[PDB]
Ligand binder design. Structure first.
Ligand SMILES: NCc1ccc2sc([B-](O)(O)O)cc2c1
Ligand SMILES: [Ca+2]
Ligand SMILES: [Ca+2]
Ligand SMILES: [Zn+2]
Ligand SMILES: [Zn+2]
Length: 231
């Protein structure tokens, strides 16, 4: 699509003056190439990343695109649950010297999920908001744990000062026919978790998600409506 850029195997789309979507692809036998999206945020003189790519090599391509196109140091990455599309590239982040953060529960599940744990653990209050001392110097990133849904550990991120919030694999697009990979999902709590994400970021109008292009808030309510039928 127009204005998108491609570096190696990766596609980048600018969403706002300081925010880009990164997209990487992995051949899933019997589906074909599955896109996964994350975010890149320029926060003054540094960059913040949300989610790895599927693989280490793809994640290194993100970092080199950042070097070439933004030319600011990457201060930290937040990864949104312990599955390959979101944490497959941890080793590349660590090799590059980027501090990594994930839900404590993601870090605990990581070995069991075949992922490398982050260096730091985020913890959350009963209302879902990150405990701030666990997310030092996060700039505009506002991290929210909406409850179990796509996985028990899934987290979400709003970008303060912008219209954007990132639902990761929890949120599906508003035309979707299904909730995707439910293999690790909590079918009972999913709908409430989707709605909690919407209530956490009530003014966000651009909802970015792992497996579809950015959508409106319709993605949230549609996701929740689909999830209500799992119960
Ligand atoms: N090659 C493993 C493989 C293939 C497709 C998906 S999709 C996915 B999820 O969206 O649930 O996080 C992880 C995953 C892992
Ligand atoms: Ca690895
Ligand atoms: Ca699993
Ligand atoms: Zn997943
Ligand atoms: Zn996914």
């Amino acid at each position: 699509e127009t204005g998108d850029q491609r570096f190696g195997d990766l596609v980048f789309r600018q969403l706002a003056p300081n925010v880009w979507q990164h997209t990487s692809y992995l051949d899933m036998p019997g589906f074909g190439a599955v896109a996964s999206n994350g975010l890149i945020v320029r926060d003054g003189g540094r960059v913040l990343v949300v989610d790895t790519a599927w693989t280490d090599d793809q994640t290194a391509q993100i970092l080199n695109w950042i070097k070439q196109e933004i030319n600011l140091p990457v201060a930290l990455a937040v990864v949104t649950h312990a599955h390959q599309d979101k944490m497959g590239g941890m080793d590349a982040l660590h090799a590059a010297g980027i501090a990594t953060y994930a839900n404590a529960l993601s870090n605990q599940l990581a070995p069991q999920e075949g992922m490398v744990a982050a260096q730091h653990s985020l913890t959350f209050a009963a209302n879902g908001w990150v405990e701030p001392a666990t997310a030092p110097n996060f700039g505009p990133l506002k991290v929210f744990y909406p409850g179990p849904g796509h996985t028990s550990d899934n987290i979400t991120v709003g970008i303060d000062g912008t219209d954007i919030a990132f639902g990761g694999c929890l949120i599906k697009d508003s035309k979707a026919k299904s909730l995707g990979n439910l293999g690790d999902a909590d079918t009972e709590h999913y709908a409430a978790s989707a709605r909690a994400f919407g209530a956490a970021f009530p003014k966000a109008s651009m909802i970015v998600m792992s497996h579809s292009a950015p959508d409106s808030r319709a993605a949230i309510t549609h996701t929740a409506r689909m999830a209500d039928k799992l119960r």
